[PDB]
Amino acid sequence: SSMYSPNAQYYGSLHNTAHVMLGRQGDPHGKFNLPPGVMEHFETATRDPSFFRLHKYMDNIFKKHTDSFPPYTHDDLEFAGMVVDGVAIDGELTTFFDEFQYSLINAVDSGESIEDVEINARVHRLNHKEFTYKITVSNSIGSDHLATFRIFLCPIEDNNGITLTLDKERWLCIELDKFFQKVPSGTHTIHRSSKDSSVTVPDMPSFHSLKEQADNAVNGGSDLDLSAYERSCGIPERMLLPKSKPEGMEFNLFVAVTDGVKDTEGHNGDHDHGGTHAQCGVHGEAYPDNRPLGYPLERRIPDERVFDGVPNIKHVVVKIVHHPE
Amino acid sequence: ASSTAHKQQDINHLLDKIYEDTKYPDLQEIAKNFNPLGDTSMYNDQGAAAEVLMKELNDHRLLEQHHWYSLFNARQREEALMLFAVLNQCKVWHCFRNNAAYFREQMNEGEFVYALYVGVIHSKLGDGIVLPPLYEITPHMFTNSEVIDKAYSAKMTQKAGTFNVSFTGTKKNKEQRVAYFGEDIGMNIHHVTWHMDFPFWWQDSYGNHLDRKGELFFWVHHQLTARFDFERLSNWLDPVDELHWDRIIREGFAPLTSYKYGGEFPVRPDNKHFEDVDGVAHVHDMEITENRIYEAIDHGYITATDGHTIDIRQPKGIELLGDII
Ligand SMILES: [Cu+2]
């Protein structure tokens, strides 16, 4: 729970206490002088497999609430006069592992009056090749209109080879992008690069790089456009796509185009929302999208006919291939 | 009369429509008028085996027709082997044929089919005969209940048809991935025929010794186990665990198969502990038996009834272990 809780005396702090409960299971009675578990730091918690069992448990609590609302109707979902004619991607969807280095110098003891030496860790990390979405829309209103583009990747089959219904897919879908763009009258193709995702941020610049850039500016006088780096909150760009398999896997790419005027009311459409607003919001500003998080996949969809009848929603099959070493 | 053509036809007729009284007039006449005790000079034992079986028959001590049969049921096996013993004593084919016809109409069909198969296999009189596949003689023991039901419906409606067999369970059951191994009708014929060729009830007084039988028993089952594990590996599954009497049997089974008479084969739930089986054994008896076998192995000798040692640190040791296991 957070300090926004209306009643912590009654509702307690389920999630934060659970982190400690799990983290301490190696020494639950303090007999062994063991330090806190990996679950007791946000730096480390996702290293523990139990992180995801705990958070699925918590996720299902939220899901009982979100499932309690009536399914969306045609009128709920329709962006009148906006149809998605096609969805395609420029570039193959390819994942691989590459190598990344970071410095261990801060971990080791130095001094006094003894020189340092370069000490690095090299890790293998998931990555993917660049691609660009091609989303063809037709705006059959006689005016340009702001639209929200909501992009999700959804499984088609489970690990047993069983084809999933839309209701069984929706809670498994992962957010790939969300952006606001003016759609002029007529039929037009919207292009969106994978690198520009509002879900992701680039790899952090190294400490050594930050020192070099700051030192070069201070010792001299140079206004470096530091307004370049994203934020550190956001799924790493390299992890935008799931690993998939060497033999390839097919997924549903789900695109919902919604009324940007209504979605952004109170926060403007032309305004800059930063590079990570989908899950990390906008630093020092209100959250720019009024819709429920997960829209339009966050309510039950018992009747797939409802979604199929909405011209501003479309999904297509895409293939992701893993390229092993 | 005892030519290959006539012997084969006789066997074909005896096994035809096995759940009904014979439809062949010549077999009907034999079953009505032949006396297994009328001329005991036809038997190498002067009628001893026929006397045993006729006394059981006349005293109404044999299993009724239209009833399940299991080779692992001591009394039912003893009854089937009483007929095998008669067939095995026949000097000439007309004795073998006439006793088969006579007892076909008196004895349980499962016992009869078993006795006739092992009688053909282990008598010189059966040389040259090709036994029909058991999956066409008793199809219930090789065909799931859904397909049998479709066959019953075809017969009720007097319409021909060919029906496709699918596997049991669902795709949610990962064990179904390898159902094509243990449910293959030929693999099942391989298995029952091996045991018909090398039966655990064999006594050399029946006519000949079965060379290295106990070692072949180890080997044929080692190969079944290793071959199944190769199918598991082929289907992204781990090797089978071993059973233990004090640990749960993780993988249950729903046969979705039925006896012709006796009902549906029983299901076993997932994750059950072994329970004592009334009239068979306690779980603890199995553990003691296992311990005694391992004592012989780790001693390097089997203990005889009078306490003397039988060395198994020699090439025949594995065979002697097959004999006692
Ligand atoms: Cu958490």
Ligand SMILES: [Cu+2]
């Ligand atoms: Cu066997």
Ligand SMILES: [O]
């Ligand atoms: O977390």
Ligand SMILES: [O]
């Ligand atoms: O968290």
